[PDB]
Amino acid sequence: SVFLESDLVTVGLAVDQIVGVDQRSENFSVVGTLKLSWHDPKLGFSPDQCGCTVKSFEDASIRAVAGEINLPLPSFSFYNQ
Amino acid sequence: SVFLESDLVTVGLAVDQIVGVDQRSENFSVVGTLKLSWHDPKLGFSPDQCGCTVKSFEDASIRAVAGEINLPLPSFSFYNQ
């Protein structure tokens, strides 16, 4: 392709339980799970420099990991949080 | 053994008091004690460099200590916390 292309992201969400509704302040609370997936060759690495097949980051948001590795990542937010 | 073997962990839990049940939001609270024990020779040390028999870490989670000493430790979490 002559032009650059946007990266494709797969998203999925599930709802486990509605734990409350506030009828005076007009808000509700929910419990669920979120999942994201995408492909980026700039994140690729060689196994022989770490002796592993999986590189993992834990207990960090997407913004923090993007700032640490200095690469753009698809950060997200809840609109009405 | 030719193959590597997983490290064995002994666990125990005791419940002291049930302090509340929420019948609308479907949750409860409890007070108790948790104990873990495991054996790992990689954590051993020589007394002659410290002159002591017990080395201790206080007021820190297992993840923090593992990140400080750069060794794998059996971290845990409560599933429905």
What is d(CA B29, CA B38) in angstroms, rounded to the nearest whole number?
A: 28
Q: What is the DSSP letter of A71?
A: S
**Residues in CB range of B46: below 8 A, 6 or more apart:** none
What is d(CA A78, CA A30) in angstroms, rounded to the nearest whole number?
A: 12
Alpha-carbon dihedral angle through residues A67, A39, A9, A1, given to the nearest 10 degrees:
110
What is d(CA A74, CA A62) in angstroms, rounded to the nearest whole number?
A: 7
Q: What is the DSSP letter of B43?
A: G
**Determination approach:** cryo-EM
Rounded to a whole number, what is the distance in Å from the CA of B50 to chain A's nearest CA?
A: 33
Alpha helices (H) along B11-61: none
Collapse the DSSP code of B16 into the 3-class scheme (helix H, G, I; strand E, B; otherwise coil) and give the result: strand
b/e burial code for range B4-23 (CB count within 10 A of at least 16 → b): eeeeeeeeeeeeeeeeeeee
Q: B48 with B59: CB under 8 angstroms?
A: no
Looking at chain B, which residue has its C-alpha nearest residue A58?
B63
- Element housing A63 (H / E): helix A62-69
Q: What is the DSSP letter of B22?
A: E
Is residue A59 within 8 angstroms of chain B, CB to CB? yes
Residue contacts between A and B (CB atoms, under 8 Å): 6
Tokens of A60: 């960090």
**Residues in CB range of B79: below 8 A, 6 or more apart:** none
Does the beta-carbon distance from B26 to A19 stay under 8 Å? yes
Looking at chain A, which residue has its C-alpha nearest residue B80?
A31
- Element housing B63 (H / E): helix B62-69
b/e burial code for range B26-45 (CB count within 10 A of at least 16 → b): eeeeeeeeeeeeeeeeeeee
Q: A28 with A18: CB under 8 angstroms?
A: yes
Looking at chain A, which residue has its C-alpha nearest residue B67?
A58
Is residue B80 within 8 angstroms of chain A, CB to CB? no
**CA nearest to A14, candidates A34, A29, A30, A28:** A34
Number of C-beta neighbours around residue B62 at 10 A = 13
Q: Which positions in chain B touch A19 (Cβ < 8 Å)?
A: 25-26
The alpha-carbon radius of gyration of chain B (Å, integer) is 18
